[PDB]
């Protein structure tokens, strides 16, 4: 056997077996930034009431789901190493988990330049003068030549603060600090 | 019925992936590209056009990709009148090498039970002709028997005497079905049957149809030997209407081989280590032996009781089906009495006056009584003395000695050894003779003249000649 390029996520399960065999095969010949553009076009033709009618049908035939997608994957735009991959999943019986692999390849390819975004969870939204700081003072932490991304979700049970999660960091400043006043009642 | 490539071989378990003609369960496959026939019987379905099957010969030299056909039926066997006097294994091939079995129609080995409205509702008694078996533990018709006693007791001479009595008054042929038997003792059984007259290598005058599945044949082919010896036994019930017999040797190796198949597939075992389907698997075999309206099948099965444990899961389940027992013990052979039958420990479930009548019950309960107190005062006479028992105890010495010698009988299949002619007695000649010893009409007869005779008129005849 041979050694392979290490993906910077290393997920597990039935996704990350096939979603690393694709990352290692396409990182050879430097086919990396191209192949995500082709995997997002099979990511639209999978959801079709004739294509998805037999991509998850058990009772069609073991063989005719191999010729029907191989004729489909080659003619319209592309003939890269993905045409072998769709032929590889279909030859094994893993056609049901096909949307799982591309959602697994996307999170594996995103970290090659991405951030795994933070999650500010405070209140009803804010103005521009207090948000463009937190979209810039959250860039002062990382410092590795990167372009940050973010999510926002509103929760009122946190009464008077904001929680944020840069990766797996969780600097919590909120109204948990009422429960921390148990030490007054704790002798 | 189509062609299927192989895809896995693990032990005695083959895995066959068809394309269109997916066979049903219990369908016999046939591997192509080999020397002699290797069959496979389909036992599951797994999805993805894959079955799984239990092989019935050695699983060596099988390549991943061989093409295996489909017979479109279960294991079909030569079923006919020209199969008596022959030997075949589980899949019909002759192994005595006397020529191929030339037969017209075949039959599959897997069927269902007789129907609810095909049964018989009046219990009848199959006379054999043996003196102890007719009276003190009578056989039913359609019933099931247990035979206890191993080697060294006078056992195989009892089996061949059954077959040379069922064909002299009843006309129904038999089957032998050795399940997992010894290859060394399958030949002394064959070669004794030839010189005794039941199998004859010249003509159309045979009685037994040997079906030998032997001990070095894989566990998938050891369970199916009592079905192939049952399938032969139904042509002489269905297609001819006779009173079949059927010997299985023995009923424990049928059970033990089912637990090996069930553990090669993966099923979690039951109590002490047997298979979960232990009573249904015995059910679907033992329910095909009944008395339908055309004819019947009778059965006679030997039982091995492991570790002297009569409540072990395998002889518990087998005793739920029995209608009799027969016990061969070592001690009765020492007295000189043949066959070695213990008349106090051999039972019969139909021993009841509504089934056997009033005359037959009040004799086999009388002669069952006179031999119970003699076992009690086989100690008082063994310590205190002889003349010290009462004068009414000098009659329980006589009439428990004159009777247990009249439970002996000169067989016919051992004709040259004893030199005496083999005698048969009907069922009203068993009853006419035992009543007159408890009545003491023949109280003036010595205890040696009651030895190896036929009717009551012979013992008396024998006594006159002496001295």
């Amino acid at each position: 056997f041979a050694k392979l390029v290490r993906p910077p996520v290393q997920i597990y399960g039935i996704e990350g077996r096939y979603a690393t065999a694709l990352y290692s095969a396409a990182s050879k010949q430097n086919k990396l930034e191209q192949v995500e553009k082709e995997l997002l076009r099979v990511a639209q033709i999978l959801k079709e009431p004739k294509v998805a009618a037999s991509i998850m049908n058990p009772y069609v035939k073991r063989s005719v789901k191999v010729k029907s997608l191989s004729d489909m994957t080659a003619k319209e735009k592309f003939s890269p190493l993905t045409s072998n991959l769709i032929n590889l999943l279909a030859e094994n019986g893993r056609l049901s988990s096909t949307p799982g692999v591309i959602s697994a390849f996307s999170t594996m390819m995103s970290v090659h330049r991405g951030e795994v975004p933070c999650s500010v969870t405070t209140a009803s939204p804010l103005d521009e003068a207090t948000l463009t700081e937190l979209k810039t003072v959250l860039k002062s932490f990382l410092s590795k030549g990167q372009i940050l991304k973010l999510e926002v979700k509103v929760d009122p049970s946190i009464m008077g603060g904001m929680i944020v999660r840069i990766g797996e960091k969780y600097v919590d400043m909120s109204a948990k600090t009422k429960i921390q006043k148990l030490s007054r009642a704790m002798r | 019925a189509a062609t299927g490539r192989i895809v896995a071989v693990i032990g005695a378990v083959v895995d066959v992936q068809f394309d269109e003609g997916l066979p049903p369960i219990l369908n016999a496959l046939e591997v192509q590209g080999r020397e002699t026939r290797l069959v496979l019987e389909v036992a599951q379905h797994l999805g993805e056009s894959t079955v799984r099957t239990i092989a019935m010969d050695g699983t060596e030299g099988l390549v991943r990709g061989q093409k295996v056909l489909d017979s479109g039926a279960p294991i079909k066997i030569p079923v006919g009148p020209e199969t008596l006097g022959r030997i075949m294994n589980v899949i019909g091939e002759p192994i005595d090498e006397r020529g191929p079995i030339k037969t017209k129609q075949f039959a599959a080995i897997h069927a269902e039970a007789p129907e609810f409205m095909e049964m018989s509702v009046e219990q009848e008694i199959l006379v054999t002709g043996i003196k102890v078996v007719d009276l003190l533990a009578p056989y039913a018709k359609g019933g099931k028997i247990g035979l206890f006693g191993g080697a060294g007791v006078g056992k195989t001479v009892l089996i061949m005497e059954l077959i040379n009595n069922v064909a002299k008054a009843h006309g129904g042929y038999s089957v032998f079905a050795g399940v997992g038997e010894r290859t060394r003792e399958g030949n002394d059984l064959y070669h004794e049957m030839i010189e005794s007259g039941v199998i004859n290598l010249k003509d159309a005058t045979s009685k037994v149809a040997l079906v030998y599945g032997q001990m070095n044949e894989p566990p998938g082919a050891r369970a199916r030997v009592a079905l192939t010896g049952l399938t032969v036994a139904e042509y002489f019930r269905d297609q001819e209407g006779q009173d079949v017999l059927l010997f299985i040797d023995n009923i424990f190796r049928f059970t033990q081989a089912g637990s090996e198949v069930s553990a090669l597939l993966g099923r979690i075992p039951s109590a002490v280590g047997y298979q979960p389907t232990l009573a249904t698997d015995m059910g679907t075999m033992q329910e095909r032996i009944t008395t339908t309206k055309k004819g019947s099948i009778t059965s006679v099965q030997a039982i091995y009781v492991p570790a002297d444990d009569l409540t072990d899961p395998a002889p518990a389940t087998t005793f739920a089906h029995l209608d009799a027992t027969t016990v061969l013990s070592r001690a009765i052979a020492e007295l000189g009495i043949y066959p070695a039958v213990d008349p106090l420990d051999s039972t019969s479930r139909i021993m009841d006056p509504n089934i056997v009548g009033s005359e037959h019950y009040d004799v086999a309960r009388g002669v069952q009584k006179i031999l119970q107190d003699y076992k009690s005062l086989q100690d008082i006479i063994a310590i205190l003395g002889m003349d010290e028992l009462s004068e009414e105890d000098k009659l329980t010495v006589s009439r428990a000695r004159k009777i247990q010698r009249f439970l002996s009988q000169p067989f016919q299949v051992a004709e040259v050894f004893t030199g005496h002619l083999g005698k048969l007695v009907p069922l009203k000649e068993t009853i006419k003779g035992f009543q007159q010893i408890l009545a003491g009409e023949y109280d003036h007869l010595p205890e040696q003249a009651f030895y190896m005779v036929g009717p009551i008129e012979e013992a008396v005849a024998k006594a006159d000649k002496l001295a």
């Binding site: 056997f1 392979l4 039935i14 077996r17 690393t20 065999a21 694709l22 290692s24 095969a25 396409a26 050879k28 190493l81 072998n84 590889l88 094994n92 | 895809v7 896995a8 071989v9 693990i10 032990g11 005695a12 895995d15 050695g58 699983t59 060596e60 030299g61 099988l62 390549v63 991943r64 990709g65 030997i87 192994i95 005595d96 080697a151 060294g152 010894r182 290859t183 060394r184 399958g186 030949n187 002394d188 064959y190 070669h191 032997q214 001990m215 070095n216 894989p218 566990p219 033990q256 637990s259 090996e260 553990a263 090669l264 597939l265 993966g266 075992p269 002490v272 280590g273 492991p306 570790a307």
Partner: protein, 509 residues
Amino acid sequence: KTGTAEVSSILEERILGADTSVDLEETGRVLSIGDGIARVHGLRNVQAEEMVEFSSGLKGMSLNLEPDNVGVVVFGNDKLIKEGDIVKRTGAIVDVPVGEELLGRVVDALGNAIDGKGPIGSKTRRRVGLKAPGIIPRISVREPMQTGIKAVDSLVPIGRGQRELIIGDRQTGKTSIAIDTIINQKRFNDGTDEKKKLYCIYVAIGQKRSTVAQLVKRLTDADAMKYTIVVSATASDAAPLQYLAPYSGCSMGEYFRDNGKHALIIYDDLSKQAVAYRQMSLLLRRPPGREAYPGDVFYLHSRLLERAAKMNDAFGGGSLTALPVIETQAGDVSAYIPTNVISITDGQIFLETELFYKGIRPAINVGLSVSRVGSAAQTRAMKQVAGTMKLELAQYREVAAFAQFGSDLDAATQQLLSRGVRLTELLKQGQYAPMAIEEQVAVIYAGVRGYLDKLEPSKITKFENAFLSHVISQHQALLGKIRADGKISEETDAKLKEIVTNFLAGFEA
């Protein structure tokens, strides 16, 4: 469910292209090795039960054919196999050298040489996995096979073409019933007759090496390693080498069966093959059963112990006799493996350690031992005296409780305590002293006829040794009139009456 060969390196090449660089029809790489079990990606054409041959020089055996890989047991150490090692094929089921160039040599379970003399010079081979004969090519056994032990030859006799199980607890005398079975054959194996010879094989499974080394020196000095093969899968090996080792020795002893000769094989012991199979199954993840044995373990000892046959005149007239050895654990003959092998074979010889310390050696129980053939596998003279002897040592067992505190009994019961304790003293026998057959018919004729009742029980084991040395030297012409005629005629039954009584006078001094 993931599948074994679905690893991240197998799928990775199939996305690149077609697999032309490796062919996979003949060679397959290894996925995962552990504890003597390998997993191989490829090898599409491998037959079941086929030897493979690894990259580091070792061998293999194919047992699991699975839809994405093959699982092969490894002979030898596992620190030589790794992940990524090419495996190849030989193209056959395993075979072993076989001839008469094995006699006097010591071989392991693959037919190689270990005694350091030199390579085997045979020009024949044989597959280890062949079948038994059928119902037809056999005949009922009629040939005596003599051990030289007064108990084994007179109470539980063996014939040629029979299985006989040596069963008993530890430290009881098991290995020594089957080592003067070998030494006794030198009487016949140097003479001129051909249908009385015998060629013995000893199989040692799992013993330590320096008990075999103490056995090639026991047999050389007693001059019986010119017709004895020694097959030795010992304890330091791998587990499949101890699995093949009784098949490897039952094919070495079938060439002597197909050619009108005779043989005798001694598996020692069959309760270590069955543990060597069980280690191999439960690492191949085959489903367990009772006592974690696999389901096919009656199928191990049934296809092996049915190759011992007595063939007939149209096939050559050969034979093969097998004595398998089984060790119980505290008299428990109702465990799993000791109840398979009692059902298969044709009798057992049962040795206890209570009788070993009460002064009865060889420590044979007579009550719990049987041979199923028995009286047909005896000479016509040993049949004559043991029919009075087996019965009278059986009447002693029923009255054997009364003997402890008894003098107020009947004169008949005081007789069975008398005669039964003389016959027990005859059957004692020293280690490594096999006897000729017609000599044992002299000793047993003295006890069972009545010429020992007037003696003291510590003077029985002296009288036998003084009766034998008088009859070897001064009556050698009458210990060849039984070895030729076979049956004791009345012209010899009246002559031994004038020897024993004319020696019983001038003895007690």
